[PDB]
Amino acid sequence: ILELEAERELLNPPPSPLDKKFEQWEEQQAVEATLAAMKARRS
Amino acid sequence: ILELEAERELLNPPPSPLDKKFEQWEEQQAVEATLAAMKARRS
Amino acid sequence: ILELEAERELLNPPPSPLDKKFEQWEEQQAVEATLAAMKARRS
Amino acid sequence: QEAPEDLLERLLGEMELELIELRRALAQTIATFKSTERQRDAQQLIAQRWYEKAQAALDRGNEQLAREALGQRQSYQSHTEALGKSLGEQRALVEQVRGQLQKL
Amino acid sequence: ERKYLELKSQKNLYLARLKSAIAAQKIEEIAGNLDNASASSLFERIETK
Amino acid sequence: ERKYLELKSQKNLYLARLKSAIAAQKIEEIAGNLDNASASSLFERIETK
């Protein structure tokens, strides 16, 4: 199972430090989008 | 399919830069014809 | 294995001090390209 | 020899069997070129993603990610360039053979 | 793996180029019989007649 | 599961595209007999006559 599991992570896009940066980007992107949406209705 | 598709474009008249010139000619030809028709009824 | 491994490095382009210079070139090339790209959008 | 006129009709028919052989090989060479073009499109797209991962890094001043993304991009762009270099080479081959076939 | 796939790519391209060469080498046979034998040997025989 | 369903989606789309290709590959057979054989071989025979 340890070998079988390892075989998976190499053929698929492996986790990378950039992925978390993409996550905090996509997350922050929606945070910026969320706050942007809020002010749109206030105006 | 890539080879089959390529076989088609060589036996038929292939796309050429002149074709777009013919298009903007035939298109402009009708644009000139259209505006020519407009003034005909105005007169 | 020591002999087998050695056989590989002679037929292929062997590591050279110039390669690191090429690396810090290609790396610096992209660093210069990266900073060049940044100012392009600022302008 | 056989009836010379019979050979003329028979021979010219044989020659047709070859012109198609060149035609198929000529066309088949096209698939190799355009196939790499999609691969190059994927490679530049993968590079384009990487710059997009660097363009998102361009925003908010996350330069080191624009650095790593562009740094990895150059490897993919070098592959893209390598595919582009191969594509450029194939472009001349297909054109001259078409001129040859058109001439032939 | 990146190296192996590249070789497998140029091989089909290299195989494609030789297929045109295979068709290329043969047309020379056309000229010989259709020009030398036909247009210079059969041709001369009846033309001399 | 989200991955598997996506593959099953593009497959029917991919199968749809090749069905057009199956109909696409065949029309070339139309031109050959209806143009070369008919409009350049049957045609030339009677036209030469």
DSSP structure string for D3-55: -HHHHHHHHHHHHHHHHHHHHHHHHHHHHHHHHHHHHHHHHHHHHHHHHHHHH
How was this structure determined? It was done by cryo-EM
Q: How many CB pairs under 8 A join D and E?
A: 53
- Give the span between the Cα atoms of B7 and D30, in whole angstroms: 9
Q: Which of B2, B8, B9 should we substitute to test contact with F (largest number of F Cβ atoms within 10 Å)?
A: B8
Is there a contact between F10 and F17 (Cβ–Cβ < 8 Å)? no
Angle, vertex CA C9, rays to CA C8 and CA C15, nearest 5: 155
Q: Do B2 and D27 touch (CB under 8 A)?
A: no
> Which of E45, E48, E49 lies closest to E37 in space, CA to CA?
E45
> Which of C29, E4, E5, A28 lies closest to D73 in space, CA to CA?
C29
Contacts of C37 (CB under 8 A, 6+ apart): D54, D58, D66, D70
Confirm or reject contact between B7 and chain D (CB < 8 A).
Answer: yes
Contacts of D87 (CB under 8 A, 6+ apart): D33, D36, D37, D40
- Cα F3 to chain centroid distance, Å, stands at 32
Angle, vertex CA B28, rays to CA B26 and CA B33, nearest 5: 90
- Residue B21 tokens read as 């010139």
- Give the span between the Cα atoms of D88 and D96, in whole angstroms: 13
Q: Which of D10, D15, D75, D98 should we substitute to test contact with E (largest number of E Cβ atoms within 10 Å)?
A: D15
Angle, vertex CA F36, rays to CA F32 and CA F37, nearest 5: 90
- Give the span between the Cα atoms of E18 and E11, in whole angstroms: 10
> Which of A16, C28, D38, F19 lies closest to D30 in space, CA to CA?
D38
Angle, vertex CA D48, rays to CA D46 and CA D53, nearest 5: 95
Q: Determine if residue E20 is labeled as part of a ligand binding site.
A: no
Neighbours of chain E (3+ CB pairs under 8 A): D
